[PDB]
């Protein structure tokens, strides 16, 4: 018996493979399927991902945004079926895995500490060049 | 209810 493989066997039906890779520090647009009575629509949540906590099918990522004067953090499961898509809007360069510290920084301070990740940006335009 | 001590507090 292999209890791990069993779990991954259960999870396998639900696993996504269509989402783009992003890192903590990247700026991201999550189009999420929302219910609002009595219809359902797509609401876009767009911000920096400050956390990606891994656990296989159970990885989840946290995105931070400041809307209308207030800071908002959203936790999304990486394989939720309620995410329509994710668009990478900017590669940001982190020097640590969790970016909790940007919560106390000015927008200007954040801007400095999260320089655009030129390398993975070049990679982004380097792919997308398709036949 | 407050009634008075009958025994002192124990000393060394």
């Amino acid at each position: 018996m292999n209890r791990g493989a069993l779990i991954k066997l259960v999870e396998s039906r639900y696993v996504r493979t269509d989402l783009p890779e992003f890192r903590p520090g990247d700026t991201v647009r999550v189009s999420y399927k929302v219910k609002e009575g009595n219809r359902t629509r797509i609401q876009d949540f767009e911000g920096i991902v400050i956390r990606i906590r891994r656990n296989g099918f159970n990885t989840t990522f946290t995105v931070r945004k400041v809307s209308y004067g207030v800071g908002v953090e959203r936790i999304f499961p990486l394989h939720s079926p309620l995410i329509q898509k994710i668009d990478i809007v900017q590669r940001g360069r982190a020097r640590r895995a969790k970016l909790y510290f940007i919560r106390n920084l000015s927008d200007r301070e954040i801007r400095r500490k999260l320089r655009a990740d030129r390398k993975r940006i070049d990679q982004d335009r380097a792919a997308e060049r398709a036949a | 209810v407050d009634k008075p001590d009958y025994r002192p507090r124990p000393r060394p």
Binding site: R3, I7, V10, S80 | -
Partner: protein
Amino acid sequence: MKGILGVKVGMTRIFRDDRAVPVTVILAGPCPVVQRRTPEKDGYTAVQLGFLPQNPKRVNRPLKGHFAKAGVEPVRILREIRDFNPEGDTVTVEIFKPGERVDVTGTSKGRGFAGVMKRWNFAGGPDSHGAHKIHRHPGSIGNRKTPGRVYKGKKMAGHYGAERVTVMNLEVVDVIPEENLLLVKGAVPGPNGGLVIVRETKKA
């Protein structure tokens, strides 16, 4: 009443109708009946189920005897389900269809010698304002000269966990017969690798 032996394998959430549902995966199948308890012979009705194959090098003669009289492979675990009499010679997860509610029994995790706070959710003592070495102590345990004793049953520190626990009316979320899995919604007593019993619920 119907039931099956199984081991707890682990937990996850799956997605079902835009909802995350916490599940515990259980490997239940397959359980061979190795004896039936009958009113004319035993005075009550049940089925002794076997579970998990065993190295015959480890099974002794009185045990070998029992298995053979039932024409059954040597198994690691023997356990009864009461008032359950399957038509077959073998019980599998398929006796459970999704949507059914079940009762899961397992052996709880053992906390060993547990203080009165962990065990019985006592308040313990203050951590300041003069508290003297009593921060986790249970307080008074009685009265005075009347009754001059302590009640049988007084909640006190002592071993806690590693005991039979049944949680009831859990949903069967899915069942994967080709791998002998059962998917139950919520939490189940005990550690991974822990033997558990799964019975149809007694609630209505």
